[PDB]
Fold this protein.
Amino acid sequence: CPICRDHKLHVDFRNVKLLEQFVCAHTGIIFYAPYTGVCVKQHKRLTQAIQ
Amino acid sequence: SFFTKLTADELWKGALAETGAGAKKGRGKRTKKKKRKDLNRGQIIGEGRYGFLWPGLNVPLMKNGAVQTIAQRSKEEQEKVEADMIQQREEWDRKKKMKVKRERGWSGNSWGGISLGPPDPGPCGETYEDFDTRILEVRNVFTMTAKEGRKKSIRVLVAVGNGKGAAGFSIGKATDRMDAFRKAKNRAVHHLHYIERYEDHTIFHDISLRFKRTHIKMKKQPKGYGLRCHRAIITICRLIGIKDMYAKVSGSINMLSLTQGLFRGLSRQETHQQLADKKGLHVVEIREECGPLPIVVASPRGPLRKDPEPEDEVPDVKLDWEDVKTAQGMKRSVWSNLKRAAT
Amino acid sequence: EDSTDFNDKILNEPLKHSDFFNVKELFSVRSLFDARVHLGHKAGCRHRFMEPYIFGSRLDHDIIDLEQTATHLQLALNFTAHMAYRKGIILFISRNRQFSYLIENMARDCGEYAHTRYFRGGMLTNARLLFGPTVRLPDLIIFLHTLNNIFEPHVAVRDAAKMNIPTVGIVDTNCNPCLITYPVPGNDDSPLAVHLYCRLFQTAITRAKEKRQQVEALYRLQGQK
Amino acid sequence: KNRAARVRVSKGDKPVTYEEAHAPHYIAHRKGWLSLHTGNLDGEDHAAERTVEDVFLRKFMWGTFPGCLADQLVLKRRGNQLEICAVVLRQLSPHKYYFLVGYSETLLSYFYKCPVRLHLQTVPSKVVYKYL
Amino acid sequence: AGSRLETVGSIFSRTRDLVRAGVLKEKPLWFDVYDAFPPLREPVFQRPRVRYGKAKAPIQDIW
RNA sequence: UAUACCGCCAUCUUCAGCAAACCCUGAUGAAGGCUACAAAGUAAGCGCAAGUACCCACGUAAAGACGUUAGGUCAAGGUGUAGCCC
Ligand SMILES: [K+]
Ligand SMILES: [Mg+2]
Ligand SMILES: [Mg+2]
Ligand SMILES: [Mg+2]
Ligand SMILES: [Mg+2]
Ligand SMILES: [Mg+2]
Ligand SMILES: [Mg+2]
Ligand SMILES: [Mg+2]
Ligand SMILES: [Mg+2]
Ligand SMILES: [Mg+2]
């Protein structure tokens, strides 16, 4: 998946620029996993980090 | 016998069997087709199995300012040359075995949604580098001829668009698929519509139309909604530049009618400015995200009427049962609002 | 630095006047009436789209409204002059064989082009293949008769619109003016009517070309000193 | 349909030389003979040996100058002399051409026991008569 | 480039839009003249249809 | 194994059609495209034709495309695939 294919992308609450890519700029909702293709494991880590 | 040997052209022409009775009326399959291999590619003039070094042909004529004499590579030296030659062949052969990753369209073996690149430049220094072409349908149509019987032809539908409102489509026909692709691509550029985009991301108003037996119902959507429509419509929308829209295709799902119907509706959509001028009234946009703030999107360039539009108590408008049924939560579908990849 | 001034003084200046070439004086409603421009075909030959321009039917003979012809003719002649002033290629098209010789002379006299013969398919939409890759197409096409010899619209009317070429056209009561840019409702059968059209379009073109030479000369003489 | 030595029409993209464009019924009308000797004249002898020599020479020259020949050979015989006229390309270096001319002239003179000369004419590319 | 869809709009509407979109690099010679002195009716293709029922022509007899 | 082919041919042919590249028509469907007092066709190339051989400009030869019959020929020779190697 996009997150797991690049080992240098770290899903951290401080990596605000990476986390922004997974949130809708116009509505602010976190895209569901089928939208971007991230596996359930990484989507769970992303959702927690965004919060 | 030396006198019975033929040339490479004659040997490959016979061994390949490209022209025969098994390749006329779909009589032979395509899997066992063999490819020509030029056996003179890596061969050097003067190089043989004995390893002789001919001054002026295989090796340089003069070395150290003196004419070289006939020499022969040692046994071990020739083995290296022979081993290296085998390695070079394997590498060259390896290159041909490698498969380049081809970006697939709607399906692995489907032509729909594949980019054909920019249209070819005109003969008078004209260029279309901004325009992008994408195939929509590839069909093997047939006619019957007295001499040959079934005559196979290719019908190709392509759509071209620069992504800034200008987009068109055309049909190309030819015996070869390459000729069909070229004809459709180049001809589509001379038949370009201009599509009015509201804020350069969506349509101005909901469009409902019927082209022959195809029903297309498009709805205006806010930013971030995405393209939630028939895949062919998604491809055409990206070429036009529309980012957010919903569309439902009913009736016959003919690709020709769908494309011709889509371009018919998008071309006839009335802009806010065109509405204000026709009505002589301000067009005020009410957004829920902005509360009661009245946003004037268009004003009449001419004189502004002073009489308010008559407010009919009950609108005599034809409602689509499918719309009313959904607003009342009466539409249960296990296929609606399914999670899908970003479009 | 000088190109912008040249264009403004020469190309953009005439576009700021309502009648830069004074084509109003070339014709009057009286002159049109004396040329039988108002005589249309019988009511049974009427084209539906020509009804807004028909004054009425006098004993089943449509009478074209010359009050509209004057305003329509004024706009067509103005557009024609402005195109001739801009050194545009004007092509006269007509398939009426009674006037083929007259129209071919009128074009040669005003330094323009005429096509009065059988129109071969693709002259305009396939020109680069018929003439050559660097051929220049007409900038204006003036139809003195918009119908072919089977009483159907001349094919070039459709092809001119395909090529985005503006068209001026004399449209009788049985013609279809939907695709003609500057339609001029009038009689296209009487020699007097056709002769008047030829004189009017030949004069406007000649005047416009001469005005272009006068304006350019004055700009050059002033430029030096 | 006749087949002998007829390059068949394609899509208009196959370049053919002047010799390849003429079928056998033009061999004395529009094109000439690629070999001139007396064996086939009335009352002349040794036509068989002249033919075997022509067939060999055309194969020897095809393999000796691989990829260089731009058209068919012209074999000429005058008395004891044998003259090979070849139209070659301008890709192989001149040094390699001179080596192959001296080599082929010497090797063939000792094989057929007669003075042999090789006259090379270079062309930038194959001369295209028409596109079939 | 140009647009050969003579049944969609007029020559001016098509040209104006293509010039705006950037497809046409230079507007044609007649474009400026058209805009300054446009015709009374925009030349839009329209299909002639037969009059059915009670529809009649508005042309009146001159008496 | 001619039902993998080259090569050389039969046959319609005692035919005149096969056509790349464009353009237009059908609402941008498979497809179709002529009227000379002409109404959408322009068409490289190939064949016919023309030229050439024989005693003429006649006649006879030669020539005769694209395709049709998986037509004939692995036994002219070459050759893909498979098989044999005391
Ligand atoms: K075999
Ligand atoms: Mg697959
Ligand atoms: Mg008339
Ligand atoms: Mg025969
Ligand atoms: Mg067979
Ligand atoms: Mg004869
Ligand atoms: Mg015969
Ligand atoms: Mg002949
Ligand atoms: Mg058989
Ligand atoms: Mg048999």
